[PDB]
Design a protein around this ligand. Structure first.
Ligand SMILES: [Zn+2]
Ligand SMILES: [Zn+2]
Length: 60
C-alpha cells in the first residue's frame, strides 16, 4: 500500500489547487481553512510562525 494513493475527499490544496489532495495532507493550525499537499508543504512560502498538522488519511 502507498501513501500517495490515499485521497482526502473534499480537501483542496491551497498551494496548487490539487483536488482531492492525494498523499499526506498538511492542515494549517493557524489559518481558518488552509491545506497543503506534501509537495506544496515543502516548497511554498507560508507564514513561518504557522504550524501544520500532518493528516495521512481521513479521520486523523
Ligand atoms: Zn499542492
Ligand atoms: Zn497558515
Amino acid at each position: 500500500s502507498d501513501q500517495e494513493a490515499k485521497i482526502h475527499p473534499g480537501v483542496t490544496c491551497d498551494g496548487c489547487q490539487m483536488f482531492p489532495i492525494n498523499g499526506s495532507r498538511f492542515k494549517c493550525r493557524n489559518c481558518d481553512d488552509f491545506d497543503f499537499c506534501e509537495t506544496c508543504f515543502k516548497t511554498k512560502k507560508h507564514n513561518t510562525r504557522h504550524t501544520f498538522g500532518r493528516i495521512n488519511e481521513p479521520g486523523q
